[PDB]
Amino acid sequence: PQGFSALEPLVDLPIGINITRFQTLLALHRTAGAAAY
Amino acid sequence: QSYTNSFTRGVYYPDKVFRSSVLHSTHDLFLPFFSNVTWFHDNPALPFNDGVYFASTEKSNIIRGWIFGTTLDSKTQSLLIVNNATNVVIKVCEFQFCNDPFLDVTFEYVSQPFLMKNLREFVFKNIDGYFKIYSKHTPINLERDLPQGFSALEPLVDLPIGINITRFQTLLALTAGAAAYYVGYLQPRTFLLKYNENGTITDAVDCALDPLSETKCTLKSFTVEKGIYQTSNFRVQPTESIVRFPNITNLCPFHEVFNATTFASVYAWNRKRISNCVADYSVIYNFAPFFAFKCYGVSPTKLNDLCFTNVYADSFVIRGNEVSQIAPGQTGNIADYNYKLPDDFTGCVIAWNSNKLDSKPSGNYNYRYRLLRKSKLKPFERDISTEIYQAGNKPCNGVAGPNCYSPLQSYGFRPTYGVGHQPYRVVVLSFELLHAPATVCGPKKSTNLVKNKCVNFNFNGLTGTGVLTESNKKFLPFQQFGRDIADTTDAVRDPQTLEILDITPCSFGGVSVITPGTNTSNQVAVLYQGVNCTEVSNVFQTRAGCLIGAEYVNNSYECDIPIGAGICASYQTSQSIIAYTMSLGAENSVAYSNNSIAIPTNFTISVTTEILPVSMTKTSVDCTMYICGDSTECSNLLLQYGSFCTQLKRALTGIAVEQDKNTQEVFAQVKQIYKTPPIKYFGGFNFSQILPDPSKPSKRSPIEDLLFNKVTKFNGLTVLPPLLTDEMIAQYTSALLAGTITSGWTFGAGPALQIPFPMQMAYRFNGIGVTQNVLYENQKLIANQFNSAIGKIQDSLSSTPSALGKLQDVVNHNAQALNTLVKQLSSKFGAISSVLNDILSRLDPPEAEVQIDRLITGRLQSLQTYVTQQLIRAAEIRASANLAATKMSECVLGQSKRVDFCGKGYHLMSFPQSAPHGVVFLHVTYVPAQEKNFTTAPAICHDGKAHFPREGVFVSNGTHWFVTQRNFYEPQIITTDNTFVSGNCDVVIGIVNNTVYD
Ligand SMILES: *[C@@H]1O[C@H](CO)[C@@H](O)[C@H](O)[C@H]1NC(C)=O
Ligand SMILES: *[C@@H]1O[C@H](CO)[C@@H](O)[C@H](O)[C@H]1NC(C)=O
Ligand SMILES: *[C@@H]1O[C@H](CO)[C@@H](O)[C@H](O)[C@H]1NC(C)=O
Ligand SMILES: *[C@@H]1O[C@H](CO)[C@@H](O)[C@H](O)[C@H]1NC(C)=O
Ligand SMILES: *[C@@H]1O[C@H](CO)[C@@H](O)[C@H](O)[C@H]1NC(C)=O
Ligand SMILES: *[C@@H]1O[C@H](CO)[C@@H](O)[C@H](O)[C@H]1NC(C)=O
């Protein structure tokens, strides 16, 4: 949608690790699944 | 209990410098005027404090010297002074005092004895390793208290001993000791000292004594003129300090590392890593008393001050005597084969007995330790490998027996064992610090909240000072602070309870001292600017602030000392300074009517003075000499900054040429030089007060002489003389006056055309709307009024100095600037000393470069500030000079119809006069007087035709109708000569039937 929704902080973690890549996990049953993000 | 008023006593010479007829401000230890001084008469230890003022009038000389020893015994070095008749012998050497030190009568200084109705004033001080003694001996009239007056204390001796002097004792030489000596204690104070031409201090002023004294210090003058003076700032200090961190909740598993009911063994010591928890050691200290609790890195209390990201816990059970092996740098079986702490270990070793719990009668063989390893273990290592030790040179072949032994062997712990073999529980805590964010700390403390008071606050790591009140603002849940438009904190969320507290800055404001002249009185009033009277004699609240010492009076007077929003203070006369709402002026209601006019019946010739600055002092600055002086290193360093000196020189040269142009524009209006005739008769008009006086060599008029009497090197600073001398400006003024007197306004617009002065003044009367007959019929009266006004001008100028306040101001400002520019040569600007040669001599070149650079930056900034202020002042003076030139052209070389430009009234003529750096204009004006009420009509109806006056107005005395000029009542019979018809009778409103003759 075309509108302003200001995002609010939830969690700040003192992890201190360098992150270079990421991945999304999904609850798929090995049932068809299709999620779009 | 004898206590006396100190009066104005105890002022000494701060340093060795001589000063003549100057007022100097010093921040030094001193005896405050009118202070708490103890008159003494067994003898306890008197504290020396920072210093002591000892005033003894003891003629009997029961007091022989002083004991400044800090112990009055042989323990430490005691300073002992003897002031016998022979000599004063300051002794420091180690003396074995007798049981009763009194005579029947290393570091030694022998001098002439201090003693000679003598007032022995002594000041004893000890600063920067020097003990200073100041003395004064003055005759006193018959009095048992300190005399009223001023006495300066000359230095007497300095000692380089510089030892700690905490207590001082008056030496006893006989036991009833009744000695009449006053003792006061000195304080860090700011003083203002007035030196005479002889070099001595005649008087002094204590700044923090009273508001009038504060304003004397601020103005650096002992006499304060009438006015309001901003002196200091007023701030409400924080009463209490508040620290607020979040609810201590969550906590480190310290109750689990202990009380584990099983510690495994020491051959494989349990390693526990703890992080991200609230550190609380109350349970640790509340556990059983500890056989051995040694901390190697930090103090146990300061453990809470230091925050650690990683805390390592190692728990094991060892014998009693093996605890000593668990220490940095220890050699032993357990230390080298089971668990080795590093040489630089930082942690706490905690050990407590476990015989009550971990000892079994049958023998607890669970706990094991290693007693055969190939080599020593590296620090912080755990070796759990248990294979057949190969002590023999034959292969063990995986079996044991001959020369092949099991690496591990167990303790057998039984309760009957004595100390030294009983099982001890040891929990070694290890702390590690690595360069990453931490987020692991100890019980952050918190205090009770204080509201509606000026408090220091530290709310969740945000520090500040202010007044905390309740706030209507509603924060979002994740927010903590509130910040306003100027990026200043205005609200805070309390961590412990989620409450929005608004922060208000604590009350602060200027302090102004409303004073009459010091000549008139010494009473003062104090205005706290912008402060509510609750936050701070008679207290009054005004929009300006809070006024203390002035009483509000309902009646209104003309403003004398401005304060604020319509409030003025004055010394009207117990009766004292009063504050009132200023009166704008007398209320006058003009009797307006449809047919009422007021015509003047007489006139007043009024002469007024207008003083205008024209030029300012021309100054040239040598940038290199000011910044650097004779130092070549400073010049080389200055070359790097650029061409700043060239720009400053260009600006100052521009100002100087502009000043010359200003004087030329104002005074060089006429090219010819006109001379007044030797026979000085001008129809009864006496111009002696404005014309030059040939008797005195100056060739200046009496008014010019009065003005010159009233108004009337360094370091690269030079004052360049003006191009036109005072004599040349006098010649210009004489030429302008002679031209005005002889030629009227004709000399301004072309050739000078002679005209008798009465005719010129008649034409000026025509210029202001009054006929010539008025002047020619009233010539003697006009002449007498002009003469009286010119006579009064001299007295008005001489009696009131403020009339010449403009020109003098300019001079003062210039001097002040120069003084500042020189005074900042003595300022350090963050260097070692203001003297460049001292810095160069004491410090090596590489280190001296930074000090010289700081001095250069400070001095160059000072020069830039001076030049910018000079440019702004030059702009102001140029505006004033342009106004003066316009007035000279339009008021002196002509008659101006502009209102209030040339005097107040109807302008007739202006006379110029020269004053130091300016021009004084004597404006002659026509003021109507003695007005009379008449009935007036817009037109007169005769023969069915309207009639309007050609010049003037129709007036009636009640029965008869006349026509008269506006500015003078000269009634004339209405005739066709002074009227024009222009219309019929019906249109005009207010027409009056009457007769017009021919
Ligand atoms: C007094 O003091 C001086 C100072 O050294 C000393 O020479 C003299 O002998 C002393 N006289 C007495 C009274 O002991
Ligand atoms: C101080 O100076 C004045 C100058 O008139 C002089 O009369 C007086 O003797 C001086 N006081 C001294 C030298 O103690
Ligand atoms: C902290 O403890 C106090 C104790 O009364 C409680 O009122 C407060 O709500 C706690 N803090 C938070 C953020 O819940
Ligand atoms: C001073 O405080 C009082 C306290 O009620 C208040 O009424 C008054 O308005 C305050 N003065 C100013 C100028 O705000
Ligand atoms: C008004 O003026 C006339 C002169 O024309 C004089 O005779 C008369 O007395 C004056 N009286 C009044 C009404 O003022
Ligand atoms: C002036 O005279 C005319 C002539 O008739 C008359 O009508 C008028 O009323 C007179 N003026 C006044 C004010 O009466």
Measured from the alpha carbon of residue B198, the closest ligand is 2
Kindly list the distances between the CA atom of residue B338 and the CA atoms of B332, B341, B382, in Å, as whole numbers in the listed order. 10, 10, 7
Measured from the alpha carbon of residue B565, the closest ligand is 4
- H/E element holding B923? strand B918-936
Of B692, B686, B670, nearest to B782 by C-alpha is: B686
CA atoms within 13 A on the CB side of B298: 14
CA distance B394 to B614: 119
Burial class (CB in 10 A: 0-12, 13-18, 19+), B58: middle
- H/E element holding B390? strand B389-390
Closest residue by CA, ligand 4 atom 4: B534
Closest residue by CA, ligand 2 atom 3: B198
How would DSSP label each residue in B456-486?
Answer: EEEETTEEEEEEEEE------TT--EEE-TT
Q: Note the resolution in Å, 1 decimal.
A: 2.8
CA distance B839 to B833: 7
Assign residue B788 a region: left if phi > 0, alpha if psi is -120 to 50, beta otherwise? alpha
CA distance B890 to B669: 11
Alpha-carbon dihedral of residues B362, B367, B372, B374, nearest 10 degrees?
160
DSSP B739: H
CA distance B676 to B742: 7
Helices and strands of chain B, counted as H and E runs: 16, 52
C-beta B89 within 6 A of ligand 1: yes
Which atom in ligand 3 lies closest to the alpha carbon of residue B247?
Answer: 1
The alpha-carbon gap from B279 to the nearest alpha carbon of chain A, in Å, equals 17
Six-digit token string for B589: 């209601």
| Chain A residues within an 8 Å CB radius of B476 | 8
| Chain B residues within an 8 Å CB radius of A17 | none
| Dihedral sign of CA atoms B125, B127, B132, B138 in order | negative
B478–A16 C-beta distance less than 8 A: no
A9–B478 C-beta distance less than 8 A: yes
Strand partners, B123: B53, B134
CA distance B228 to B206: 20
Asked if residue B425 lies in contact with residue B440, where contact means CB atoms within 8 angstroms, the answer is no
Six-digit token string for B255: 């109750």
Six-digit token string for B122: 């002594």
Alpha-carbon dihedral of residues B377, B380, B386, B390, nearest 10 degrees?
0
Asked if residue B151 lies in contact with residue B118, where contact means CB atoms within 8 angstroms, the answer is no
| Chain A residues within an 8 Å CB radius of B439 | 14
Asked if residue B428 lies in contact with residue B347, where contact means CB atoms within 8 angstroms, the answer is yes
Pairing mode, if any, of strands B992-993 and B940-941? Answer: parallel
Asked if residue B674 lies in contact with residue B884, where contact means CB atoms within 8 angstroms, the answer is no
B476–A14 C-beta distance less than 8 A: no
CA A14 to chain centre: 19
Which atom in ligand 1 lies closest to the alpha carbon of residue B82?
Answer: 2
- Among chain B residues, the shortest Cα distance to A9 is held by B478
Asked if residue B979 lies in contact with residue B996, where contact means CB atoms within 8 angstroms, the answer is yes
Six-digit token string for B107: 């570091």
Mutate to test the pocket of ligand 5, among B957, B963, B994 (most ligand atoms within 8 A of CB): B957
DSSP B889: I
Strand partners, B541: B546
Assess A9–B contact: CB distance below 8 Å, yes or no: yes
CA distance B905 to B704: 25
Phi, psi of B657 (to 5 degrees): -60, -35
Which atom in ligand 5 lies closest to the alpha carbon of residue B957?
Answer: 14
Query: Which experimental approach was used here?
Result: cryo-EM
Kindly list the distances between the CA atom of residue B153 and the CA atoms of B31, B39, B53, B469, in Å, as whole numbers in the listed order. 12, 20, 11, 54
3-state secondary structure of B847: helix
Residue type (1 letter), B279 = A
Strand partners, B270: B315
CA B713 to chain centre: 30
CA atoms within 13 A on the CB side of B821: 28
Helix axes B845-887, B632-639, angle to 10 degrees: 70
CA B831 to chain centre: 22
Assign residue B23 a region: left if phi > 0, alpha if psi is -120 to 50, beta otherwise? beta
Distance, CA B214 to ligand 4 centroid (Å)?
A: 29
C-beta B223 within 6 A of ligand 5: no
Six-digit token string for B272: 């526990």
CA distance B315 to B257: 7
CA distance B339 to B269: 8
CA distance B345 to B338: 16
Neighbours of B183 (CB within 10 A): 16
CA distance B248 to B934: 95
Nearest to B437 among A8, A9, A14 (CB): A14
CA distance B703 to B803: 13
Asked if residue B647 lies in contact with residue B960, where contact means CB atoms within 8 angstroms, the answer is no
Closest residue by CA, ligand 1 atom 2: B87
Q: A19: which residues sit within 8 A by CB, 6+ positions away?
A: none
Q: Rg (Cα) of chain A, in Å, rounded? A: 16
Which atom in ligand 5 lies closest to the alpha carbon of residue B962?
Answer: 5
3-state DSSP of B290-322: CCEEEECCCCCCCCCCCCCCEEEEEEEEECCCC
| Dihedral sign of CA atoms B275, B279, B283, B285 in order | positive
How would DSSP label each residue in B825-845?
Answer: TS--TTSS-S-HHHHHHHS-H
3-state secondary structure of B672: coil
Alpha-carbon dihedral of residues B203, B206, B212, B214, nearest 10 degrees?
130
Distance, CA B958 to ligand 5 centroid (Å)?
A: 7
Strand partners, B408: B370
| Dihedral sign of CA atoms B561, B562, B563, B567 in order | positive
How would DSSP label each residue in B38-54?
Answer: EEE-----EE-TTEEEE
